Amino acid sequence: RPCTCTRCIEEQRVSAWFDERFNRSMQPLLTAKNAHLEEDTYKWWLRLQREKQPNNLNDTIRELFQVVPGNVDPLLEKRLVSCRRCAVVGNSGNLKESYYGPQIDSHDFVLRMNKAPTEGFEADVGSKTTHHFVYPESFRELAQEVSMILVPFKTTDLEWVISATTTGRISHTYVPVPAKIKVKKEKILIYHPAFIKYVFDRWLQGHGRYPSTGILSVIFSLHICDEVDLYGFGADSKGNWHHYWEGVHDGDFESNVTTILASINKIRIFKGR
Ligand SMILES: CC(=O)N[C@H]1[C@@H](Oc2ccccc2[N+](=O)O)O[C@H](CO)[C@H](O)[C@@H]1O[C@@H]1O[C@H](CO)[C@H](O)[C@H](O)[C@H]1O
Ligand SMILES: Nc1ccn([C@@H]2O[C@H](COP(=O)(O)O)[C@@H](O)[C@H]2O)c(=O)n1
């Protein structure tokens, strides 16, 4: 249905560059229904981190959906709203003294990532979080309201969700990872591995080894939201790349994708300081 915002990200024939890349049939979250991967997609995904002798994926996903919800709506019930407005907050130190907190919090969803804190940074980054993307090597404890979106880069990452909410047996991947987390099982969502390959193939055109968490978060919000505003992406005005509180990816090519999306009004970018 056409959205009721000023513009709608889904709208075709605004930009053929967007229409070529956006695929409305993509499902960005894993469910029991959608979890079968095509062989080529599965082989691509195993190659990202090259784990030795991974456990069978369908067995892992079965066990995963004994623990966390296995029948989420893949677009997080976007069907029940007419205009969903989202803020996607990256980690750039361009948010320092930006005073973007209130405008960030004014959105329906606020999506954060990795170990980025809000505590003590609220005036700049906001206090609201509806969804927060993590992987085992870049988790921090989340407030209890917050949906955790696990972005899996290897079979162990799904195993880790199982373990860290239950037995606490996985404490190491390529680095130490938390053996337990406090996040409630009902608040966990799983980014679909096929949607990672869609991001890589169609949005990044095969640039990088695989997509960064920032660009995965952006394309995910193109699908789940009608209006998307980006904060904390890019360097600051002095050209520094640092975090606001403290190769594998092609950051130039990903940056250019977000610049082009902004130019066609499919997102807005707040550049900060
Ligand atoms: C910097 C880099 O290439 N990181 C890769 C690498 O990481 C390591 C491997 C072995 C020991 C230490 C590290 N490490 O702490 O940097 O290889 C792993 C796979 O074994 C990852 O691909 C690292 O890349 C990170 O992956 C995460 C997702 O796990 C995320 O994409 C980060 O953006 C990326 O740097
Ligand atoms: N200086 C920065 C810092 C982070 N970022 C974005 O925020 C996302 C998460 O940052 P971290 O991986 O450093 O936690 C990155 O993958 C990137 O797209 C950015 O675009 N500019």
UniProtKB/Swiss-Prot annotation:
One of its GO terms (biological process) is protein glycosylation. This is CMP-N-acetylneuraminate-beta-galactosamide-alpha-2,3-sialyltransferase 1. It catalyses: a beta-D-galactosyl-(1->3)-N-acetyl-alpha-D-galactosaminyl derivative + CMP-N-acetyl-beta-neuraminate = an N-acetyl-alpha-neuraminyl-(2->3)-beta-D-galactosyl-(1->3)-N-acetyl-alpha-D-galactosaminyl derivative + CMP + H(+); a ganglioside GM1 (d18:1(4E)) + CMP-N-acetyl-beta-neuraminate = a ganglioside GD1a (d18:1(4E)) + CMP + H(+); ganglioside GM1 (d18:1(4E)/18:0) + CMP-N-acetyl-beta-neuraminate = ganglioside GD1a (18:1(4E)/18:0) + CMP + H(+); a ganglioside GA1 (d18:1(4E)) + CMP-N-acetyl-beta-neuraminate = a ganglioside GM1b (d18:1(4E)) + CMP + H(+). Glycans are attached at residues 23, 58, 256. It comes from Sus scrofa (Pig). The chain holds residues 60 to 343 of 343 of the full protein. It is found in: Golgi apparatus, Golgi stack membrane; Golgi apparatus, trans-Golgi network membrane; Secreted. Its main location: Golgi. The gene is ST3GAL1. Belongs to the glycosyltransferase 29 family. GO terms for molecular function: beta-D-galactosyl-(1->3)-N-acetyl-beta-D-galactosaminide alpha-2,3- sialyltransferase; beta-galactoside (CMP) alpha-2,3-sialyltransferase activity.
